[PDB]
Amino acid sequence: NLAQNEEVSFTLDGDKFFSKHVAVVGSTGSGKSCAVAKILQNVVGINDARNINKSDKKNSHIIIFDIHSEYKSAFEIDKNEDFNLNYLDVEKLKLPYWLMNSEELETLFIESNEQNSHNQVSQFKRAVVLNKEKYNPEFKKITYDSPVYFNINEVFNYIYNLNEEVINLPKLSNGELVENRQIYFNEKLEFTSSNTSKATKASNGPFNGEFNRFLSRFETKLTDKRLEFLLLNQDVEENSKYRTEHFEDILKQFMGYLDRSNVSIIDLSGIPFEVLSITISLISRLIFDFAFHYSKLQHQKDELNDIPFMIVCEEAHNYIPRTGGIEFKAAKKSIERIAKEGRKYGLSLMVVSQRPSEVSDTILSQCNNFINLRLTNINDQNYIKNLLPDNSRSISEILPTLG
Amino acid sequence: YGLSLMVVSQRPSEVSDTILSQCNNFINLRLTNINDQNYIKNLLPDNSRSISEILPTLGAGECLVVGDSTPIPSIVKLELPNPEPRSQSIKFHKKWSESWRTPSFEEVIMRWRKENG
Amino acid sequence: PKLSNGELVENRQIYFNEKLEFTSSNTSKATKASNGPFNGEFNRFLSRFETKLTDKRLEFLLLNQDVEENSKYRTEHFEDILKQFMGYLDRSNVSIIDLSGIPFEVLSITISLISRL
Amino acid sequence: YGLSLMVVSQRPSEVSDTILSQCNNFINLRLTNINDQNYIKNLLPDNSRSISEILPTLG
Amino acid sequence: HNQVSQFKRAVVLNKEKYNPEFKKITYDSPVYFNINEVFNYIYNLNEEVINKIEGEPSL
Incomplete structure (x- = not known):
């Protein structure tokens, strides 16, 4: 209802509002979360x-990137009215680490608080791609960026085979002269000492x-x-139950199609600050890829997307800052990917924040x-006044005077 | 060499000044x-800086022409093109007024990888 | 440079055809090896x-020459290419260049290429 | 997190603007x-600019 | 740059040696690290001499 007159009903053009990006900024105490919640209940159909x-x-789709767990009660109703919410807390989130591109994998594993040693990134990259090839023989082209299943424990055991004492033709001190190195992944292995020699060289590893x-x-x-939400500890059976053929299931629970939930909250409260950007970027990249493939499939039949997606970003000033370090590179890249493009493939971003002066202008x-x-x-x-398309002596004088 | 520019932009303040x-x-x-x-006021010739104040008030389908080719500035009404230009944009609201529509969520994942990758 | 099999490479130009495996660094004198610059x-x-x-x-750039038949294109595959942008193949009077599906990180490069051509 | 600031200074033009x-x-x-x-005038809320002219006179 | 790298390396080394139980020993970790042997570590780096006699490795 109009602020000046409480009897007149105020309405917008919905097709021109949610189909395009919206920025939601303000300050504490004005009920910015209040306004976001009211708009969300209006669009999803929550009334009193x-x-x-x-x-x-109804075919209302919403995925929310939450960092406080302060929006669950915005849609948690009595069960009898049948409005299910896909609450994705840190515990229940299942994001496999093998759907993960080169930069994210390197930042998760290799990157440390110190300076790396030579021939470390290359060795880890080779181990990961080789294990990907070994586990997935059916697939023709397997590369470092190929989203295929692999075991991190086997790669660790390969790096655990640091202790090479018998070669600078194979000379491995397992059995007598074992040739194939594929046994490296299976077991930690133990080698002999360097105080010996034979027809070939028996000194320390390169x-x-x-x-x-x-x-x-x-x-x-x-x-x-x-970090249990990466399925990293593959020793447990449940962590190893998800495979390349199981990429289908882990993506339904982002869309809420496993429980036909119109609202899908992704609660990131327990996510460590070191792996937050990787999670955001992975989710954003997979959503964009799904939308892209879905849209391109339907061009053959001459119609566009049928299931549009609406993404809101709770205080996105953190992972897409105006200025910052290398911590949030991938998150910025992915949010820019869905920002610049997504009108064609059916994606809309209603970014919300408290400080719009600290959010990257490439998305605002x-x-x-x-x-x-x-x-x-x-x-x-x-x-804000500069960004607003219309500001003529009536919009530039109201921002501080708001109630 | 036979190359001249004409610029179409929503926000002239953001396009580089090296062309505008x-x-x-x-x-x-x-x-x-x-x-x-x-x-716009700054780039316009001084001959129209007085008539340039009308820009926030041009009705639908009306444009103001200023420059050398026209003898004097004028407000020109433009006829609609045939065929009209249309963008196949998706408007989210009607698709949200329908029931749940499953994607079958199988052939899309198959399309993720063309043959194997 | 010394290969793993011991054959010294005199011409680095062999690197173009395939990848090559090298030896290991040794501090002894019989098989002294030093890392390259x-x-x-x-x-x-x-x-x-x-x-x-x-x-x-990014298939429009034809970057996967190794397995696809994109090595067919040559310096011989030429100005018949140029006439496609400007519309001499089909004698089209309007050269519309749609860039909706082009990924965003390669848009500027393509625009610059077409403009410079 | 349960921490707030009550800043005290005599030269607001010297204290960093990004906390004041x-x-x-x-x-x-x-x-x-x-x-x-x-x-201090420019940093104050709009409703107090008119009443803020007392600062040189307060004793 | 070299001073910063060497200082952080020495601090990390001392922190790891004196705190074996802790795993994520970081340069910002509030664990004990004595400064006498850090200064000594810088002293010995500034006065180290490498041996290049043939046969034995260069240590």
Whole structure:
């Protein structure tokens, strides 16, 4: 209802509002979360804690990137009204680590708080691609960026075979002269000493004595409970139940199609600050790929997307900052991917934030609708007023005077 | 060498000045951004800086022409093209008014990889 | 440079045809080996370069010459190409260049190429 | 997280602007430096600019 | 740059040696690291001499 007159009903053009990006910024105390929740209940069909869409389930799609777990009650209703919510907390989230491109894998495993040693990134890359090839023989082209299943434990055991003491033709001190190195992944293995010689050379490995602390940090990662949502600890059966043929199931639970939930909250409260960007980028990349393939498949029949996706980004000033370090590179890349393109393939981003003066302009300059609440910071006011397509003596004077 | 430019932009304030200043003739439609207003005012010749104040008020289908080719600035009404230009954009609201429609979510994943990758 | 099999390479030009395996660094005198000036300095460069080559959405650039029949194109495959942009093949008077499906990170490069041509 | 700031200074033009802008309420005593008064005026909420002209006079 | 790298390396080494139980020994970790042997570590790096006699490895 209009602020000036409470009897007149105020309405917009819905087809021109959600189909394009919207920026939602403001300040604490003005109910910015209040406005977001009201718009969300209006669009999904929550009215007076009751679902209008009882008999039939409307095709409303929403995925939310939550960092507080302060939006669950915005859609948690009594069960009798049949409005299910796909609550994806840190515990229930299942994101395989083998659908993960080169940069993300390297940043997750290889990158450390120190300076890396030579011939470490290359060796790990070779181990991962070789294990991908070994586990997936059916697939023709297997590369470092190929999303195919592999075991991180086998790669660790390969790096655990740092201790080569018998070769600088194979000379391995397993059995007598074992040739194939594929047994490296199966077991940790034990070799003999260097105080011996034969027809060939029996001295230290070319990589000998250079991965030691890399094994220390790496195995520390392999036994991390906070990172349990990557299915990293593959020893347990449930972590190994998901395979290349199971890429289907892990993606339904993002779309909520496993439980036909119109709203899919992805609660990222327990995600470590070191792996948050990788998670955001992976989810964004897979959503964009799904939308791209889905749209391109339907061009043959001469119609566009049937299931549009709507993504909201709770305080996105963190992972797409205006200025920042290398921590949030992949998240920025993926959010830019869905920002610049996604109108063609059926994707819309309603980014929400508290500080719009600290969010990257490469994503803020593309929202065709804005709902800004009360502002207290002057640079916030100036930046918002400059970004707004229409501001003529009536929009530039109201931002601080809001209630 | 037979190359001249004509620029089409929603926000003239963001296009680099290295080209917009090279334009001699202008087709100015309705504008609602003060920065665009001022930037256009600055680039326009002084002969129309008085009539240039009408830019926030051009009705639908009306454009203001300023430059050398026209003898004097004028407001020209433009006839609709035939066939009309249309973009196959997706509007989200009607697709959200329908029931749940499964993608069958199999052939898309098959299309992810053309043969094997 | 010394190969793993021991054959010294006199011409580096063999690198073009295939990849080659080398020997290991040794501090002794009978088989002394030293790392090259560019040893291990292109690992991230190589990874990103393979990532760019293996992209399926960038097929218009014809980057996968190794397995596809994209090596057919030559210096001989030429100005009949140029006439496609400008429309002399079908005698089209309007050269519309749609760039909706082009991925965003290669849009500027393609625009620059067409403009310079 | 349960931590807040109540900033105290005599030269607001010298304190970094990226914390003073975080302050929501103000306790303004007499100010005699014009460069500080202009800053405190520009940082204040709009409803208080008219009443803020008392700062040089408060005693 | 070399000073920063050497100092952080020495601090990490001392922190790891004196705190074996902790795993993610980082340069910001609030664990004990004595400065006398860090200064000594810089001293010995500044005065180290490598042996290049043939046969034995260069240590």
